[PDB]
């Protein structure tokens, strides 16, 4: 005969979602709102356990995206402003030894310490910061008629310090260690961790930088390959190194704008003028797309001509690659990595443009002014991935064409959080036994 018995502390679980913390070892990132990290994380193997994951219905990506954009807004509350920056601002061309009108020498009136005396000052501006209204030429600052401009305080570091997300009590994080995972389906190797591994919030577009490499092959993951309104994420098993420089060697000036406020402008040019660029090698690159073609050829079939082609239109944010090296924001033309067709010491210079009034999150009515930095920037990174998209249209099973995709920041992170799934512990449980309570 059998009776009910009660067990408390039973290892069963459910799927759940929750607000994760931050943990790490005067930056806008980690040092402000995180806790000290675990010096010795554990990784418990769970033999015989088979779960099912789904990297596209995971909610760790979307609530991280919420918390990243909150940090850039709650940090800039105490960072001056630039309401008085708008002026008619007569301007000419810079006459230096210039290999090339993409840099201008403007001039404008501003208020001095006394708020009743005019002060005629000047500084440099990039071509993209200057708008013609209609003798000589009267220009307007960009994004005056839509938004309000806030200078990011030039004491705050932006350097991407890695983030470790840790679950609170009564929860657990699973991890799918095995390979050959197109984001869904089962998982034979599950473990249990306290904290996700190193996540570095790096806001790039069209090409993933400083990511995590793949295991053996190039892993291609997408929600559905026949669905054109979806992005394709490629992941490299070997890095391809890229070197962005600029011969700037610029100067920094400042203008007092009200009592206790300061605006940091660009001073003059001590040297010559040359454009920026970014070099990639034609051997590690040309024998990387061979690997991507090989995995693309597997989905679509055989005898599929695969073409690569550049971006077909949109905002500057989605048709260029945008870095952040040292505190400057680049916009490099990458239409030479993707110009290729595939059947059956030389490098590539990628030109680049720089803008100082930016809008990182593609929002309405927000802008920030990036302050200049002294010295020449030399930054080395390596590319671990591509975000592709496919053109729809006619039914010819002879050629497919892929372009660089973009338009969403929630793909830099879904590439990293495809390993985890947050569960919920339920300690109670009954089962029958041959045991009787004697009263």
């Amino acid at each position: 005969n059998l009776w009910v018995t009660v067990y408390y502390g039973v290892p069963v679980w459910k799927d759940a979602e929750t607000t994760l913390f931050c943990a790490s070892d005067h930056n806008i990132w980690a040092t402000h709102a995180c806790v000290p990290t675990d010096p010795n994380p554990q990784e418990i193997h769970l033999e015989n356990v088979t779960e099912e994951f789904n990297m596209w219905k995971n909610n760790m990506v979307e609530q991280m995206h919420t918390d990243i954009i909150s940090l850039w807004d709650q940090s800039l509350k105490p960072c001056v402003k630039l309401t008085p920056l708008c002026v008619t601002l007569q301007c000419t061309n810079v006459t230096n030894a210039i290999t090339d009108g993409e840099l201008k020498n403007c001039s404008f009136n501003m208020t001095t310490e006394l708020r009743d005396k005019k002060q005629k000052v000047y500084s440099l501006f990039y071509r993209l910061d200057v708008v013609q209204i209609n003798s000589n030429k009267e220009y307007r600052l960009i994004n005056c008629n839509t938004s309000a401009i806030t200078q990011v305080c030039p004491k705050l570091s932006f350097e991407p310090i890695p983030i470790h997300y840790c679950a609170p009590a009564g929860f657990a994080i699973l991890k799918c260690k095995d390979k050959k995972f197109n984001g869904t389906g089962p998982c034979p190797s599950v473990s249990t961790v306290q904290c996700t591994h190193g996540i570095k919030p790096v806001l790039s577009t069209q090409l993933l930088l400083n990511g995590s490499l793949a295991e053996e092959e190039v892993m291609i993951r997408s929600e559905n390959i026949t669905n054109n309104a979806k992005n394709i994420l490629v992941q490299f098993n070997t890095p391809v190194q890229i070197n962005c420089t600029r011969p700037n060697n610029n100067t920094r000036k400042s203008i007092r704008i009200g009592p206790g406020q300061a605006f940091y402008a660009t001073g003059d040019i001590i040297g010559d003028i040359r454009q920026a660029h970014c070099n990639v090698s034609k051997a590690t690159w040309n024998e990387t797309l061979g690997k991507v073609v090989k995995q693309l050829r597997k989905h679509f079939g055989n005898n599929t001509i695969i073409r690569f082609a550049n971006s077909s239109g949109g905002d500057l944010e989605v048709t260029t690659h945008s870095f952040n090296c040292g505190g400057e924001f680049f916009y490099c033309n990458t239409s030479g990595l993707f110009n290729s067709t595939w059947i059956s010491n030389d490098s590539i210079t990628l030109p680049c443009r720089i803008k100082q009034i930016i809008n990182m999150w593609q929002r309405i009515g927000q802008a920030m002014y990036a302050p200049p930095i002294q010295g020449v920037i030399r930054c080395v990174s390596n590319i671990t991935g591509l975000i592709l998209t496919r053109d729809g249209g006619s039914t010819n099973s002879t050629t497919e064409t892929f372009r660089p995709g973009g338009g969403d920041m929630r793909d830099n992170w879904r590439s990293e959080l495809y390993k985890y799934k947050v569960v919920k512990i339920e300690p109670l449980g009954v089962a029958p036994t041959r045991c009787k309570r004697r009263v």
């Binding site: 009776w3 502390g9 290892p11 418990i44 769970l46 015989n48 089962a431 029958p432």
Partner: protein
Amino acid sequence: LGFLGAAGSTMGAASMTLTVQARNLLQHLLKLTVWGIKQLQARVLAVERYLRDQQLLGIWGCSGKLICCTNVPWNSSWSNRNLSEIWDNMTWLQWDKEISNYTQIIYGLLEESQNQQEKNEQDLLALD
């Protein structure tokens, strides 16, 4: 065998480690406020979830225990297995799905039929 440990093992073993998992169940000033509440929203949560299980075991008479035994005859129609095909051959993670729909049928046949009945009989023996 840390958190959740023997999650693959049979139910027959799996429960010699229950205490291992029982101990786991518990100038920028405006930014310093929001990110403080996000910690208290979780710390208060685990205290409520711990206390809403211990109460349930207080009302079942199994207070201050981890394994206990009741006085509720198991029904044949609650699963059609043997004594051994449940302990030696299934896991808890699978067994939780087996009788998931039958939970609150059991939890009423606990308390209102087990412990109210015995508690009334105790005062009879004291009055004797």
